Symmetry: T
Subunit: 145 residues, 12 copies
């Protein structure tokens, strides 16, 4: 029933809890409405999902195949560096995806430069905050037609 699925990895539920300094008030829910609205404007159905449990995300990707999800926008967050299971899930279902990160990963610790997903994504957007999700959706829409 849903054309595009947005997946948020672990810790992203913490957006907007931190402070008036570190981030402002933008929360995961705010991003989700903005993303739903944008899809609705383009007559596309859009579902979202967040968990801190790798298996929950894997399950959800499997469920997306049965639901005929055409494209996934995923921010795997920390799991990009660690989860080959997440990689094999996306590959196994054969749903193309776009990888999104809020922050510039290449600007932090060296271990963050490695991704188990990037080489198999259509593309990647790093360091543009929430707008990254939006840019990925815009591309996805362009490609769904």
């Amino acid at each position: 029933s849903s054309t595009i699925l947005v997946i948020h990895g672990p810790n992203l539920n913490l957006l907007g809890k931190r402070e008036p300094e570190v981030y402002g008030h933008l929360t995961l829910d705010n991003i989700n409405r903005q993303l739903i609205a944008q899809a609705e404007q383009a007559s596309i159905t859009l579902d979202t999902f967040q968990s801190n449990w790798e298996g929950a995300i894997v399950d959800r990707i499997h469920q997306a195949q049965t639901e005929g999800v055409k494209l996934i926008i995923i921010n795997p967050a920390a799991l990009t560096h660690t989860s080959v299971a997440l990689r094999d899930a996306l590959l196994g279902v054969a749903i193309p995806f776009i990888e999104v990160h809020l922050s510039n990963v290449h600007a932090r610790e060296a271990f963050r430069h490695h991704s188990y997903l990037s080489d198999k994504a259509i593309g990647v957007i790093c360091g543009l905050g929430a707008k990254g999700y939006s840019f990925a959706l815009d591309y996805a829409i362009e490609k769904i037609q």
Copy 2:
């Protein structure tokens, strides 16, 4: 209750799900039945377990110790490359194990050559498809009475 436990890692539930010749026709369920039948022929009880959640598999291994499981045949799939927790579960319960992979892991990406389990398995079978599980079971049967 069960002398031998067969563990399937993440994504193995997808076997046979893209039926017309992507992965072919064989399912996880099919593999399980073949193995249960083989064990029954040799008067050995055999349980199986599959999950996409690392913690579920870890829990299962612990339960296996309390059940007196004698040997584990495990296809950790992606987790072989990533999970020291899975390694420490198997070592902590001290149940010998045989590592099985359907595909030839050495023929794919370089990150798939590294295993957190292989050096502690009795042995390993890769690349022989489902027959790998059957060979492991055959071996396990002869090791036991």
Copy 3:
């Protein structure tokens, strides 16, 4: 309510499932009680948590922020080597922590020398058995007061 939080990672529930054979007779429960008792003597509230599921530990760390936990004492066990999600959880909630390991890690396989948490901990204690947790608490108490 609960004031200092102690987190035990995967497989630590196996402590004392045995004679003198991986360890002696000390259990996770025994360690916990000693810790609760030590904190009670200093008029500090202390909660504990263990799980074999990475996501359950991540969720618990998030809950800790809401409940105003001032300091976490964490034995991530295997997860120290593998989980950047755990790192990002501790960092995202901005609760300082002390890393504790029962055994000496540096005396085992090379892959156990790498930690995704050590560099962000206040400090680390390895190889001193359960007393490591007590020392961490002692330090945590003096840091609070």
Copy 4:
């Protein structure tokens, strides 16, 4: 200061030159007009520059300092992997920039995973073809406003 400069690196002049696809038709000139048009529709002035000569590009970013330039969108192409001179040019003029690549750089040779620019960029977009420039521009436009 409310002008934007788009820099194309070496070999991007070859876009569209080999008749049909894979990745035919679309040319550098087409991309430039699209971008100019997009900047005109938001009342922003946009220049473009392509060269196969590192020094020409370095000169051009020194010029950009002396003129209005508030943000650079750069596709360095091959120079991403090789030119610290390009890095020190962007850092020396202190003009923020967004790195863009048409293709998924992580999906090709290992030497393409290294970038002398990425860690200093605001952000990076790879693998989304020409839309990547457009997305970088959209972001840039709501960074002046």
Copy 5:
């Protein structure tokens, strides 16, 4: 003629020749007889070859092409880690092969983790003693019949 060829690398002639405990009582000749019988039972002809000389094995593999050998079961032993000539022999004659090791190669020195053959084999069996050959043969029989 030949149909399935079993190749034993250097030092495998020593099997069962430091008779007390280490190794076992089992000899290379015993393994060969067992395999010849197993093949006879399935109406397949099976030849065997051992040498401590790399060139002899290479020559043998060439001969196998001219004899119309359908599948090779090879235990290259030490040569796995060192011989690209061997690799290029197997590839040059284009006869599929299964790699077999008696012992768990991944449990020993790090230099044993590397193979110049594994990535081109159908599959690999390590650490199951002589039964590994037998399993390889069982797989081979089914592939032909």
Copy 6:
């Protein structure tokens, strides 16, 4: 002398010779008196030693064997990363030891992550300031029974 020896490596004499934040109040002598007191309180004799000279420390470790020292608590400071001679002294005399560092070694330069002692210590404490010495001693007292 005798029973427990505390060794301080190079540059630890500078403690509390800077008053402000780039050290603080606490001197090396203060630490020494605290430990002596703590040992006296448990009826254990405790000697201490500092030097900036690798040989002096080595000579003292040899002397410690003659004196029947039961356990060493050592903060090798910079020598942890460089001195195999120190490692061989401790191993040669066969006196178990506990490694202590004031600061969190893992939070600093990558060359401080390597230790020529850690793997042979009973255990290691880093990042807990002077209290690290006290915890090591507490452990040392309980173990000498």
Copy 7:
């Protein structure tokens, strides 16, 4: 019918220095003449080009596509170890090429063992002096007709 283009990289203009033997008498122009003559002898047109500027060479390679050049013989010299831009130029215009070096590159510093071209050349000739260009031309002629 056919142009062959010979490209000389940076510093090859210096051929003919401390003339009676530091290197020999032979100059770049001499090499060109022999090559031009050789080609005329086989009714093939042959242009040549040298520069010390990466961009000039790159521009030349683009011009070659528009000129219908069939094969390039390139001595990139120092640029073989540094220029992915040069690689992408040759690949982008899709003109097969032969890589030539006067001196034996493997016999010098380790950084000269790496090439950004070699893996995409038809073949490579190193260490045979100027005869290497002639051999490459001889091969290019046969290959064209």
Copy 8:
């Protein structure tokens, strides 16, 4: 006798067996006869040798010294990557050599980039098929005079 010796390594005897598709119709014997003829035309004697046995090639190189061979043209094939014995043979007899490979070794697996012979060869030719031998011979002729 101005003798030149052409050495063919392991698996080169297979040339012209897998006839129509993967590689062509040309044989080792063909290559040899063209080379003998090319040498006769220039009044130089030329012997040839192929083996799959490292020791046979080593013996042959020693004989070459006693026969007064002036120059060796060697295609070590797989042995280039593995045989320091072959290197030391060439060095020990002090006969200059040219290294020849039919295929472009740099275009295949990363392990093929390493050579135990290249750094000591006069030069190297890869990827030009059998003409590589002819070019080496032509160079050898001019060198000997």
Copy 9:
């Protein structure tokens, strides 16, 4: 007189910009005049050259050999880390050189610790700002007078 050439690499034309607090009081032009004056004061002619184009600097080094330049003082800037071409230009013309960097190159990012020039320089000066050029010149004067 006895001509000395001072080469400034890419980005050094960025001279001084926003002077207070971006360690940039003095221009490239100010350094040049100072050096010209120092050379005039010792009766030595001194030319200077800056460019952002590698090929312009290489060309200038070739012209310097024909002009009988005795010694080069070069601040390659970024080029130090990337240009073997530059290295080969300096070695090909055989003009001894002194490498100078304004900033302490070893104090910045790890890729700045590698130089394609240092090992062939007479010596190197880093970190001493503009004085470093003046010290190189002084040394160059004593070497010729």
Copy 10:
């Protein structure tokens, strides 16, 4: 007020001990008098020190903080590659320093390219002989007013 301390590391006392052939004839004492003189002419007091014992040098650096030494010129010699204790001494006293080496360290063995001091020095002078000390003194003088 402003003492400047020159420290010479191990083996530098051998300067002038196999005098010919115009390579190594100036002594350490010559260098010292030459520096003392240069300092007296600028009304700055200058002490010097040489040892072959790491601890002696570390003691001197500590004494230098007590004495109000404003800047250290150090030629650690072999110790630059090995001594983190030296690094920590200079950092612990917070006396800025300039690293000097007589020979060009980058032109010798690869292990000489690593320094435990360089990244924390103001700057470094390699390869200019004894004149490197003088240039460091000249810079040091101008820095103290």
Copy 11:
């Protein structure tokens, strides 16, 4: 026999060619006779073996086990760096061995620092010429009584 076997690897048969410079005057036969004589003086039986063929050496080591050889003195020459087969032969027959090299292996190319035998030898002697063999023999004689 009460035997000591002496094994010489590939290229050691060349000892003796070019008396003045590359090679002194000692031959393999001289060495042998000098060792036989030494063994006879001590009433010990000594055999010797040289080959350029790995397999021949391996066969000889297997033969030595049947003959009751007590200790092997092996100069594996080039095979020390390449042959795990040789390693597994010596281990498989469980005859202790002493490794000998004529030249200082550590003074030559980096690849000569690696040995597949050294870690399993009783000891190793390098760089002492032929006397190395004599010293190994002297040790071997004292060991057998």
Copy 12:
């Protein structure tokens, strides 16, 4: 003629403090006396030296050149892996040396495989216990006629 100097490194004074075997009995003295006796039987004067202090050993090596020592036999023990200062001492005095180790250094930890002396020694003996020193002395006597 004159003197041979035997240098013992750190911890070698501990020899003989634990029977029957952790290598008990034999003392450094015992060794020293043996070597003195052996040199007196060949009319050679032999001095010996041991320290745990790197600087004491360095000083002794300088005060060895002055006394016309002709050859040094050094067991640097741990310092072989760490001391470039020890290297530059032996090289600065230009006294040839032989490196000796009691134990097989290649059988122990990987960090013991690296030496800062080996490559400059005449040769090396490891793993032959105290007889290694004798063998070195025997060699030294024949060399120093």
